[PDB]
Amino acid sequence: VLPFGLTPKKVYKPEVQLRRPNWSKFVAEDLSQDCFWTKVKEDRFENNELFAKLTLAFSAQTKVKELKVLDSKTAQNLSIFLGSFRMPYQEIKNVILEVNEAVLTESMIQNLIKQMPEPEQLKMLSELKEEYDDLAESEQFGVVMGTVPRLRPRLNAILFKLQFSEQVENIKPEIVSVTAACEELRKSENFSSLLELTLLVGNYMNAGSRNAGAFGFNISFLCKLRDTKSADQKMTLLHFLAELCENDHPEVLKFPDELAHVEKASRVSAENLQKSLDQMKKQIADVERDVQNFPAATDEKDKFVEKMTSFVKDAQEQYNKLRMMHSNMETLYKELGDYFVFDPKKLSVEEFFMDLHNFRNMFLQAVKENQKRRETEEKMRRAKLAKEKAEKERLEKQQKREQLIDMNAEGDETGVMDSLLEALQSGAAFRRK
Amino acid sequence: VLPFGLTPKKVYKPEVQLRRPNWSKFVAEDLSQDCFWTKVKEDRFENNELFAKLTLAFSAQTKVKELKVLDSKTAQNLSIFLGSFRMPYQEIKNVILEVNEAVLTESMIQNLIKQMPEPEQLKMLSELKEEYDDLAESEQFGVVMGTVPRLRPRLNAILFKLQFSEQVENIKPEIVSVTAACEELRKSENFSSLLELTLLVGNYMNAGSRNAGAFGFNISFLCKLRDTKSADQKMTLLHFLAELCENDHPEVLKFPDELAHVEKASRVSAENLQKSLDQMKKQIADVERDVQNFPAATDEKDKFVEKMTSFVKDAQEQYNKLRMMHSNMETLYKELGDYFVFDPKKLSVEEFFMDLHNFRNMFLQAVKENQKRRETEEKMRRAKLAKEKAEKERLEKQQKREQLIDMNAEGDETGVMDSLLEALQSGAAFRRK
Amino acid sequence: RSAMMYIQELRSGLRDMHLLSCLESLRVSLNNNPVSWVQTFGAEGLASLLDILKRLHDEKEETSGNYDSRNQHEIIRCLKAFMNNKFGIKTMLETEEGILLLVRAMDPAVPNMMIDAAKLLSALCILPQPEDMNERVLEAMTERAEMDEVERFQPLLDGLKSGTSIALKVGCLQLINALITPAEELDFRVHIRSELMRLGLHQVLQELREIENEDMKVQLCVFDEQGDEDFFDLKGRLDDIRMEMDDFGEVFQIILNTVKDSKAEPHFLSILQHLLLVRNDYEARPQYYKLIEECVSQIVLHKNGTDPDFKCRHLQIDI
Amino acid sequence: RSAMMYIQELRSGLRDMHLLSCLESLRVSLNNNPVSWVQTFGAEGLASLLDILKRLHDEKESGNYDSRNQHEIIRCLKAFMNNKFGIKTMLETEEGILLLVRAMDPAVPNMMIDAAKLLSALCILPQPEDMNERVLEAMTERAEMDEVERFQPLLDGLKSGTSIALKVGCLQLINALITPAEELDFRVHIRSELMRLGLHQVLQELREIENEDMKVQLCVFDEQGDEDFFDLKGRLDDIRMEMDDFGEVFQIILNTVKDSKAEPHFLSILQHLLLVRNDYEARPQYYKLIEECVSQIVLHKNGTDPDFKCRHLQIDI
């Protein structure tokens, strides 16, 4: 009760509740006689009708039925899931057995899988089929789904189907990108010529030691070219080679354009394509086993054995095209290994086409570094010529004015002025250039 | 030897030894039949005098006297030292004893301390005086320096002397900075006006919470103001406060200018100042005590005791003026600690002023951001009005032209064309507005 | 009544004088008869008129003397009487060549037909519905110019030239106005008026201000009016630029964006380079930029709403 | 010899025709004795000549006949400076060049002729450094104590009423000030100042005169302005080579214009450049004509600024 020589700050009662600064406050007696916060029993020195304006900006406004089988985990989750689905239970069943393509989506099926109670609890629900009306919403769904033969397998096959064409478009482009790059890098004789040019230049520098008269080098080393530079440290081997091409062999400058797909292949995971095709083959073999172990379609609506056999034929067809390309792709890589001499087993395809992609970009960068640097030379050579020429002309003009009068030291005679005035008159003092 | 199906690559003999790439080379029997490096026996495919342009860019071109006392290290160090210093050994001694300010440098004394043999050796060399001529270069220096009394302390004192007027100019500027910002913060009523303003806004926002009726808040929280923003995340509390000072209290916006030495204070060191002065105080009393134990000058050249008595009176005269400024500065910070109520011992000087500096910049930031947002509101209001202007006038033109042909559900009239040309040819059919 | 038979008379392929006496009585019908009569004539009889018109147009295998261009003028009078009502207007516009053939009808060589033909197009131009009417008329004139290998306004210019008649001089300037005044966007009105000046309108216009004809002064005064509007609007667009673009870096970017990859790029660079020569005198350098500015403002913000002549040289300054 | 006698005569305070008779015979002595004799008169004797002149130039009231006295001093000065000592000795006085400048009164032609003739000879000297700038510096000094244009005297000596020989001597000095100067900006700066004062309409009248000495001077003034144009043409090529990047050039223009009255105008130019109407074919031609106009304004031939009072411009092909 009562603070150190002052009155409590007015208690406010706002209309709208506001966002606030959660600061460490100072209550009454954290203050001393001569401190700043005692002087501010003002609180009026800055009063307006801004509370309206402040409130506007910082407002923070806006039994029946019992459970006989299922645990309250699943019987609650289904209550929500079925709340969003709104589809008659006797229709969902029919759409599952028919595999109605127009109604079914990848999203829809994926929810059912997740939301379904395990086969143990479906069985215990299909022994209570008669007493259908007394059951809760969640369990009513189950009693319907319990009469669907081998649900868990049936639903898995449907998913893989609706997901099949989508995952072919995950493998294919990337199989092509690595196929293209392997064939572009094999076709490029401009690339070829760079190597020949590099070898020669290298073979000469290697003088008379360890390497010298070498028949080749590893394609990997291509990025390391930039690592050899002049003694003055002004420029690199890459640069020199690039400049040698620029002047003497302009054809070589076109090799970055001949390796079109090389970037796309730098990004493709080699290990993930292997895993993908191994998974696709597995998923095929799964539906294959499911089809063989399926009961006789004991109602007119069960189209499962019919439509899935039509899918295994097709899914295997597209897969064998896919595999062909992959094994083809891998061949063309091993082909490159044998051709440019490098171990294809120690460098994965991404890894190899990354080193290549990087080099491309180093070469193109070295090419503009050669232009920019050469542009600096021609301007600076023209600027100093124009300044030599300006200075030469300037001196010539100076001397022509100095041939008038020897302000030096020679014997005093009385021409001088009468000699200057004559040159002014005739124009001899104002020599041109 | 005759290689694997092809002929050897020519041996070059270079003039200048060049810089070479160190690639993993391929020799003859590394290749295969159909590989790339066999086809490139084409070393002729590219051949110029570039071999001469390459060698250009990448060339890489350009008794007596025995020891008796010193160890192999020290004697060697002195041999390189004394073949560079070139000053006579009798002269070196004389420069030290006199403390000759025209000869001595900071650079010169420092090198003496490092290159000097240590007391034990100097003592062991001082007993070989008579055979000075038979000694080696380094040991000659040794015997001569041996006769100088208390050399280690004598040199330590000379160094600190030549170094004194430097460290004065390291402590002072930093002292002044903090002294000023402290005075700058205390004097500015515009910053004071913001805190008042912030607390008022602050107290209303805290509604009926754990805060509200606060007599203040810690000054560090100033950077935390930005953290509280509007519902629409488009404007913050700091942006509000800037704009409220921009409109209703323009005086406020002058404080970032009132706080000129705050930046320079944000970069000082609280501890290192104390360190520096405490290292100076000890160093004054080092020489003071070294001037008391010194033996009386036994030649006309020993000017130590005379000259260093002039220094200690002079150095303590300057230290005490610094010690004044420092404890005064600390007082001023203790003063700010109480005025703005914050623990001066649990928040260092640099700590405080960095927070203050950060907030200073945050505030201008908010002001710039506000003029920028507001300009985008003015150039979007007028722009939409310049569009509502044209659209109204565009419909006004249409409503004038349609007053000749009515398109909704007409009857009959063969005039029309006669009514068109009666105005077209008479000029009325070209309105003004 | 008798309209269905006029259609048969046209398609039996009447020639020379027999056709003209048919068309002359058809015109008499289409004027004096009611609205209802022309609708049952409608699209059928109209597309016949336009096919006989198209036929007579492709009889141009001889100049310096024609035998049947008297037939052509009668069709134009028929088309006028036809379009005298709201249905005919609507029906005319729906034809694929109704307007185009009215444009091929415009010939300075034979005055009277062009007066009537350019009067119909001038009426179509000032039409509310449908949308961009004057622009269709322009398209026809362009289409005509393509097949002839001539400039699209050339006949309109040839008709204005002092050798012809007073009714044609007005009739051509009327269509000039009728093409320009209904058009709403500025860059178009100017774009066309500039095409008229390049073809040499300004020379001709200063001859027509001598003539003391009233129906002529009306068209000059309207033309002059619409030309002043354009200047005023350009001056207002200058004010909007002055108030929206006030940052150097922003303005320079905009120009750069507008100029990039065109033939104006080399010139803009050269303007900036030349600006680096404005002598380094404290006092002369502003006067340099002011005069430069002053010149430019006369080039760009040019009087009467036309491009400066790009084949000539000369410029004055205020007030 | 008798040199000290003259100094004692000059410092004695002679007047009217007495002062004249003495100076007359001093001019004779100066022009006829050896160089030896001039040196003994020397700095002392020149100083008094200049003192007498400084007294005479202070004239407050038809006119003074002592223009004979003033002109006669100028004549001694020519004789005195007719040998290498006299020149170097005159260049050392604080008020020598200035007093000559003050003796350029178009209202007494023949004196101005002789005075402007000396000032011209000083201008085209190799040593010391920038002689022309000193002569110009003095013309400015005289112009401020009179509150006139520093080139008014010169222009007045060129106007149509004046003698043909005054006209030559005048334009002679003009060339003496422009020609030796090395920096392009400075030459153009001075020439543009002459035109500003009204040199252009005058030169028109001056070309029609068939006087040999005159024709020579106009040739030089033409030549010296034709040079400047070439150097400017040259300067422009240097620019066209170095400044090939849009961003860089634009930065330089801002850097030179920033914080000068020239700034608003540059924005105004650019704002207009937005206005060039949006049409595929008409736009590049606007930018060409704009470029044409800016080319004419900047690279003005004759080595002069454009007349900023001139309100009409032709912008050819």
XYZ file of C-alpha atoms in Angstrom, chain C residues 4-276:
273
model
C -38.078 -11.281 -104.873
C -38.034 -10.485 -108.609
C -35.337 -7.795 -108.376
C -33.079 -10.619 -107.123
C -33.749 -12.750 -110.220
C -33.157 -9.768 -112.547
C -29.690 -9.299 -110.989
C -28.620 -12.958 -111.357
C -29.793 -13.290 -114.972
C -26.656 -11.238 -115.710
C -27.830 -7.937 -117.176
C -25.151 -5.809 -118.888
C -24.400 -2.289 -120.208
C -27.592 -0.179 -120.257
C -30.144 -2.925 -119.434
C -28.533 -3.431 -116.024
C -28.455 0.331 -115.278
C -32.173 0.777 -116.005
C -32.787 -2.124 -113.621
C -30.641 -0.638 -110.837
C -32.132 2.852 -111.347
C -35.669 1.547 -110.736
C -34.427 -0.565 -107.815
C -33.046 2.592 -106.151
C -36.423 4.280 -106.743
C -38.114 1.342 -105.001
C -35.730 1.129 -101.982
C -36.243 4.829 -101.164
C -39.996 5.262 -101.551
C -41.144 1.828 -100.323
C -41.552 1.056 -96.584
C -39.135 -0.623 -94.146
C -40.838 -4.046 -94.388
C -40.175 -4.266 -98.148
C -36.382 -3.991 -97.762
C -36.143 -6.782 -95.143
C -37.640 -9.358 -97.530
C -35.060 -8.009 -100.001
C -32.563 -8.390 -97.143
C -29.371 -10.449 -97.309
C -30.169 -12.227 -100.606
C -30.614 -9.150 -102.821
C -27.835 -7.266 -101.046
C -25.192 -9.967 -101.664
C -26.287 -9.871 -105.314
C -25.750 -6.100 -105.474
C -22.301 -6.741 -103.997
C -21.552 -9.495 -106.516
C -22.495 -7.399 -109.550
C -20.484 -4.638 -107.877
C -17.577 -7.101 -107.501
C -17.988 -8.091 -111.179
C -17.864 -4.491 -112.481
C -14.805 -3.857 -110.309
C -12.941 -6.691 -112.069
C -13.634 -5.075 -115.472
C -10.516 -2.950 -114.893
C -8.630 -4.317 -117.922
C -8.587 -0.852 -119.547
C -8.129 2.745 -118.324
C -8.311 6.264 -119.874
C -11.942 5.430 -120.735
C -14.490 3.051 -119.243
C -17.910 2.029 -120.543
C -19.663 0.810 -117.360
C -18.689 2.727 -114.216
C -22.122 4.366 -114.402
C -23.476 1.014 -113.209
C -21.106 1.106 -110.219
C -22.414 4.495 -109.056
C -25.999 3.265 -109.257
C -25.228 0.334 -106.920
C -23.679 2.841 -104.461
C -26.943 4.810 -104.532
C -28.850 1.558 -104.028
C -26.600 0.669 -101.062
C -27.316 4.152 -99.650
C -31.078 3.691 -99.986
C -30.727 0.130 -98.618
C -28.735 1.353 -95.591
C -31.246 4.163 -95.047
C -32.825 1.996 -92.322
C -31.505 0.203 -89.181
C -31.816 -3.341 -90.578
C -29.787 -2.547 -93.710
C -27.024 -1.038 -91.595
C -26.989 -4.163 -89.434
C -27.162 -6.500 -92.471
C -24.477 -4.614 -94.417
C -21.969 -4.988 -91.576
C -22.492 -8.753 -91.519
C -21.248 -9.225 -95.111
C -17.636 -10.320 -95.677
C -16.983 -7.730 -98.410
C -19.788 -5.155 -98.039
C -17.483 -2.540 -96.545
C -14.370 -3.518 -98.547
C -16.123 -3.103 -101.902
C -17.393 0.300 -100.723
C -13.696 1.188 -100.291
C -12.698 -0.011 -103.783
C -15.513 2.296 -104.910
C -13.471 5.304 -103.726
C -11.717 6.668 -106.795
C -10.521 10.285 -107.218
C -10.721 9.835 -110.996
C -14.540 9.745 -110.853
C -15.649 12.274 -108.149
C -19.395 11.690 -107.570
C -19.147 7.989 -106.672
C -16.351 8.599 -104.138
C -18.373 11.379 -102.456
C -21.241 8.938 -101.827
C -18.958 5.981 -101.058
C -16.820 7.942 -98.548
C -20.033 9.345 -97.018
C -21.294 5.827 -96.224
C -17.975 4.810 -94.675
C -17.980 8.101 -92.711
C -21.389 7.125 -91.355
C -20.263 3.590 -90.453
C -17.231 5.040 -88.627
C -19.283 7.062 -86.142
C -21.438 4.021 -85.244
C -21.821 3.058 -81.526
C -22.460 -0.657 -82.130
C -20.486 -2.669 -82.903
C -17.310 -1.775 -80.936
C -14.298 -0.769 -83.058
C -16.099 0.353 -86.223
C -13.730 2.968 -87.668
C -10.988 0.329 -87.330
C -12.837 -2.117 -89.621
C -13.130 0.674 -92.196
C -9.365 1.168 -91.852
C -8.810 -2.586 -92.278
C -10.754 -2.499 -95.565
C -8.679 0.435 -96.805
C -5.547 -1.525 -95.894
C -6.890 -4.630 -97.649
C -7.575 -2.595 -100.779
C -4.073 -1.126 -100.640
C -2.528 -4.612 -100.435
C -3.958 -5.896 -103.731
C -3.256 -2.579 -105.521
C 0.310 -2.175 -104.113
C -0.497 1.457 -103.152
C -0.537 3.415 -99.844
C -3.808 2.912 -97.909
C -4.733 6.609 -97.535
C -3.405 7.579 -100.994
C -6.870 7.830 -102.595
C -8.115 10.014 -99.701
C -5.049 12.220 -100.237
C -5.534 12.244 -104.038
C -9.136 13.358 -103.559
C -8.090 16.258 -101.332
C -5.622 17.606 -103.922
C -6.812 20.880 -105.432
C -7.510 19.529 -108.957
C -10.808 17.828 -108.069
C -14.110 19.327 -106.746
C -15.358 21.148 -103.620
C -17.767 18.387 -102.621
C -14.950 15.793 -102.823
C -12.439 17.912 -100.930
C -14.865 18.010 -97.990
C -15.987 14.371 -98.413
C -12.388 13.162 -98.059
C -11.560 15.303 -94.993
C -14.886 14.145 -93.518
C -13.746 10.522 -93.726
C -10.321 11.544 -92.385
C -12.102 12.961 -89.332
C -14.552 10.049 -89.182
C -11.620 7.627 -89.023
C -9.782 9.578 -86.284
C -12.370 11.118 -83.896
C -14.252 7.928 -82.775
C -10.991 6.128 -81.888
C -10.455 6.253 -78.129
C -6.770 5.368 -77.546
C -4.302 8.222 -78.213
C -1.384 6.214 -79.644
C -3.800 5.283 -82.436
C -5.228 8.722 -83.306
C -1.695 10.113 -83.477
C -0.345 7.001 -85.245
C -2.820 7.600 -88.061
C -2.591 11.404 -88.247
C 1.166 10.893 -88.565
C 0.546 8.521 -91.495
C -1.479 11.327 -93.101
C 1.346 13.856 -92.601
C 4.021 11.520 -93.994
C 1.817 11.141 -97.072
C 1.855 14.947 -97.200
C -1.322 16.244 -95.575
C 0.185 19.374 -94.007
C 1.075 20.747 -97.452
C -2.469 20.120 -98.746
C -4.261 21.354 -95.600
C -2.767 24.826 -95.930
C -4.330 25.101 -99.379
C -7.788 24.171 -98.115
C -7.725 26.976 -95.517
C -7.784 29.423 -98.430
C -11.165 28.147 -99.752
C -14.110 30.137 -98.357
C -16.444 27.097 -98.179
C -18.497 26.602 -95.010
C -18.820 22.785 -95.132
C -15.052 22.818 -95.618
C -14.249 25.096 -92.645
C -16.391 22.828 -90.433
C -14.148 19.834 -91.216
C -10.873 21.760 -90.789
C -12.093 23.194 -87.476
C -13.103 19.704 -86.242
C -9.803 18.227 -87.460
C -7.882 21.048 -85.724
C -9.974 20.500 -82.548
C -9.277 16.746 -82.370
C -5.575 17.539 -82.987
C -5.488 19.912 -79.997
C -7.201 17.363 -77.756
C -4.340 14.978 -78.510
C -1.703 17.568 -77.550
C -3.543 18.353 -74.308
C -3.768 14.599 -73.481
C -0.068 14.161 -74.225
C 0.681 17.084 -71.910
C -1.407 15.392 -69.205
C 0.428 12.095 -69.782
C 3.636 14.093 -69.245
C 2.309 15.233 -65.862
C 1.505 11.638 -64.845
C 5.064 10.627 -65.782
C 6.383 13.571 -63.713
C 4.468 12.390 -60.654
C 4.890 8.620 -60.911
C 8.498 8.338 -62.132
C 10.728 10.478 -59.895
C 13.526 8.014 -59.125
C 16.479 8.161 -61.531
C 17.334 4.448 -61.273
C 13.713 3.445 -61.847
C 13.197 5.737 -64.881
C 16.441 4.621 -66.484
C 15.371 0.996 -66.046
C 12.006 1.660 -67.696
C 13.644 3.291 -70.736
C 16.192 0.462 -70.805
C 13.338 -2.101 -70.775
C 11.452 -0.250 -73.547
C 14.595 0.159 -75.670
C 16.224 -3.283 -75.168
C 16.640 -5.372 -78.347
C 15.306 -2.705 -80.748
C 16.875 -0.208 -83.168
C 16.497 2.612 -80.611
C 19.062 0.983 -78.312
C 22.121 2.167 -80.321
C 20.648 5.705 -80.318
C 19.874 5.854 -76.578
C 23.423 4.782 -75.770
C 24.724 7.530 -78.058
C 22.555 10.155 -76.382
C 24.042 9.216 -73.001
C 27.584 9.223 -74.394
C 27.118 12.708 -75.897
C 25.876 13.923 -72.499
C 29.398 13.150 -71.220
